Paper text:
The flavin-dependent halogenase (FDH) AetF successively brominates tryptophan at C5 and C7 to generate 5,7-dibromotryptophan. In contrast to the well studied two-component tryptophan halogenases, AetF is a single-component flavoprotein monooxygenase. A large domain tightly binds the cofactor flavin adenine dinucleotide (FAD), while the small domain responsible for binding the nicotinamide adenine dinucleotide (NADP) is unoccupied. About half of the protein forms additional structural elements containing the tryptophan binding site.
The indole binding site is completed by the side chains of Glu200 and Thr373. The NH group of indole forms a hydrogen bond to the carbonyl of Met216. The amino group of Trp forms hydrogen bonds to the side-chain O atom of Gln500 and the carbonyl groups of both Leu199 and Leu215. The Trp carboxylate forms a salt bridge with Lys587 and hydrogen bonds to the side chains of both Gln500 and Ser523. Trp binds such that C5 is positioned correctly for halogenation. Rotational pseudo­symmetry and pseudomerohedral twinning complicated the phasing of one structure. All data sets for AetF soaked with Trp scaled well in point group 422 and showed a larger unit cell with a roughly doubled volume. Explicitly searching in P212121 gave a unique solution for four molecules per asymmetric unit with TFZ values of 19.5, 39.3, 41.1 and 101.6. The refined twin fraction for twin operator −h, −l, −k is 45%.
Residue numbers in the entry: 1 to 607, 631 to 655
């Protein structure tokens, strides 16, 4: 009888199928003829956008070792073409059918399909993706609508893309909001560009969770009074974070939108705008929309008349063309019967690492963990190794399952505290998840085995991408050595991120907050770098309309709209004039001097002197314990 049956083949299943093939483990795939959202967009000519995740976190290690030459954000078209490439490789192992039920028994599961053919398999892996009504809404969007008003009740990456397609046709956008977290998907470090996933250095949580909190959360929590940051100019973007009860930050369950800042979009695309726009690189700078009044934030209880399609704000009954509210993504799971009898209910927090449900036997979930930043590939590549190791090695299967409920309890205590399960529990920081899985599999690194300072840069500062853990050991991929070499050379061995931690080692969280925003351009939501691109924004809108073959009238200054903009930006108009011109930009000075210190001792063996003390203390970090990794 079959050893492994995989249900669903799109993107998440790729690395697991690759490993089962290499161990020549018997397996079968069943995926529906229907296809994915990527197929639907392909079939309607709608793959004209880009990923919000960098290439090095969005493509699998066995592609990166062949294809990586620089950091960049691939297009949707590039993403899907990689999906299809791998489908052509394994299509002979795919039965085109739709799974309707799984009866889970002691040794095996009985799988049913719509064609009526049944299958028996010892191990069952589900990688079927998620449902979103927002997908159908993008597949039916008319991008030639112009001179209209739109009302949004949710803000997310899908909503942000629609706003980017609506802005150039002179459409006005109203956001009825209880706040959202937005982050520049690319930032500058002493002028040079870094995708945000490059600057997370997540293993510094092992030094101290308080130090790691100071490294990451001042752009998310309103910790600085600096009047240049968007959460001071537009306080309706602030969310109610009272649910957070973990000492691990960024907390599991936090989601952010990643967007092109206009200064970085200009840097990359201004010399060939019409071509870049047509390739899928669209300007989606929400901070620029608020700055210019093209998007306004209004209180979440602003009244809407759905009968008349009006919304009333600033004393104005504003008629609107369309109202938009996105649904909750739910996973696409078939009916699963505990013991062939009891319906199973999915709950992310009641599974181990989002993969192992504790009510079932030999059933695994692949692709249902979401990364807080970067691509899903980092997550699904590590999940695939975990799953493959579970399927093919009984000693590991037993070592994990013998205390499964206790591992889940300790995991949840660490990352959720006493919070009730939330809809977004499945979102995790990618460098915590890949490192968590690595330590479970045993392909992690050990902080105490670093010899030189260059070793400490790799352990702590080099991003915890899946390929980081595939240089040596059980899941080693050929070519990973040159890839890490390329990445280090191209990012100066990540000395810049390492120096950030050193600069804040003795600050409290408010000192750290103001230090983050003392740079000439701080990483995220710097409102000082918007007005200077007003001219370019007009060039962008003209070029966008040329690509879309549309004629649009911008002569009518919407006076009603201008009035509503003025009402909505009163805090901005008060705090923005407080923006200071400094003599010293403290963060820029500290990072330059810290980088020059590190590159002079890069090759020194572990043997300012207070920085020396800090660096030597990285060999035995005292917050290294993760109790869900142990077998008691
Ligand atoms: C608009 C949009 C933009 C995105 N952008 C990014 C991005 O920039 N970066 C990123 O990392 N991720 C992004 N994602 C995430 C994206 O969902 C994943 O990267 C990927 O598409 C999901 O892979 P999957 O294999 O898990 O699901 P899918 O690709 O949806 O594959 C699941 C497959 O299983 C099939 N299937 C489902 N149920 C059954 C069943 N019962 N029986 C048989 N077959 C079944 C489906 O038909 C489908 O073919 C985006 C998602 C969307 C919707
Ligand atoms: N540590 C870097 C990058 C960073 C901060 N907060 C983040 C949140 C998410 C991703 C990256 C970051 C900085 O302070 O600029």
């Amino acid at each position: 009888m079959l050893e492994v049956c995989i249900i669903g083949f799109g993107f998440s299943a790729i690395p697991l199928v690759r490993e089962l093939a290499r161990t020549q483990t018997e397996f079968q795939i069943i995926s529906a003829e229907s296809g994915s959202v990527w197929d639907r967009l392909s079939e309607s000519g709608r793959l004209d956008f880009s990923l919000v995740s960098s290439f090095q976190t969005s493509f699998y290690s066995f592609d990166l070792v062949r294809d990586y030459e620089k950091d960049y954000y691939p297009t949707a078209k590039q993403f899907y073409e990689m999906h299809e490439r791998w489908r052509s490789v394994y299509e002979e192992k795919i039965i085109r059918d739709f799974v309707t039920k799984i009866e889970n028994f002691k040794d095996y599961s009985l799988i049913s399909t719509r064609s009526g053919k049944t299958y028996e398999a010892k191990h069952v892996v589900l990688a079927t993706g998620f449902d979103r009504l927002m997908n159908t809404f993008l597949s039916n969007f008319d991008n030639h609508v112009s001179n209209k008003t739109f009302v949004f009740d949710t803000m997310g990456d899908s909503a942000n893309l629609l706003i980017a397609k609506l802005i150039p046709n002179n459409n006005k956008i109203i956001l009825r909001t209880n706040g959202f977290t937005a982050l520049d998907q690319e930032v500058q470090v002493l002028g040079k560009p870094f995708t945000l996933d490059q600057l997370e250095s997540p293993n510094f949580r092992y030094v101290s969770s308080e130090l790691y909190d100071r490294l990451m959360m001042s752009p998310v929590y309103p910790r600085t009074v600096n009047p240049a940051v968007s959460y001071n100019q537009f306080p309706l973007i602030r969310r109610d974070f009272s649910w957070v009860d973990s000492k691990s930050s960024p907390p599991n369950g936090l989601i952010a939108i990643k967007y092109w800042p206009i200064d970085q979009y200009y840097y990359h695309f201004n010399d060939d705008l019409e071509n870049y726009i047509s390739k899928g690189y669209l300007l989606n700078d929400i901070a620029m929309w608020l700055h210019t009044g093209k998007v306004i934030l209004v209180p979440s209880d602003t009244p809407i008349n759905f009968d008349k399609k009006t919304i009333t704000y600033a004393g104005i009954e504003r008629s609107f063309h369309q109202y938009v509210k996105g649904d909750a993504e739910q996973p696409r799971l078939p009916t699963i019967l505990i013991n062939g009898e009891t319906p199973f209910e999915y709950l992310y927090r009641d599974t181990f690492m989002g993969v192992i449900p504790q009510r079932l036997n030999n059933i695994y979930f692949l692709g249902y963990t979401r990364p807080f930043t970067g691509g899903l590939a980092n997550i699904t590549e590590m999940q695939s190794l975990f799953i493959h190791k579970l399927i093919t090695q009984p000693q590991f299967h037993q070592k994990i399952h013998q205390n499964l409920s206790k591992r889940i309890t300790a995991y949840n205590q660490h990352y959720y505290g006493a919070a009730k399960p939330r809809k977004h529990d499945h979102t995790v920081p990618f460098g915590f998840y890949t490192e968590d899985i690595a330590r479970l599999i045993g392909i992690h690194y050990q902080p105490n085995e670093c010899r030189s300072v260059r070793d400490l840069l790799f352990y702590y500062a080099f991003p915890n991408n899946a390929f980081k853990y595939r240089l040596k050991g059980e899941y080693a991929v050929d070519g990973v050595d040159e890839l890490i070499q390329k990445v280090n050379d191209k990012h100066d061995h990540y000395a810049q991120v390492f120096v950030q931690a050193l600069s804040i080692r003795n600050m409290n969280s408010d000192e750290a907050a103001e230090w983050d925003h003392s740079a000439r351009r701080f990483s995220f939501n710097d409102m000082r770098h918007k007005e200077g691109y007003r001219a370019f924004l007009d060039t962008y809108l003209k070029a966008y309309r040329q690509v879309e073959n549309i004629s649009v009238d911008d002569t009518v200054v919407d006076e009603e709209w201008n009035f509503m903009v003025k009402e909505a930006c009163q805090v901005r108009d008060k705090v923005a004039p407080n923006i200071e011109e400094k003599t010293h930009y403290s963060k820029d000075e500290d990072v330059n001097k810290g980088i020059r210190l590190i590159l002079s001792i890069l090759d020194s063996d572990i043997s300012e002197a207070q920085s020396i003390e800090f660096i030597r203390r990285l060999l035995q970090p005292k917050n290294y314990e993760l109790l869900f990794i142990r077998e008691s």
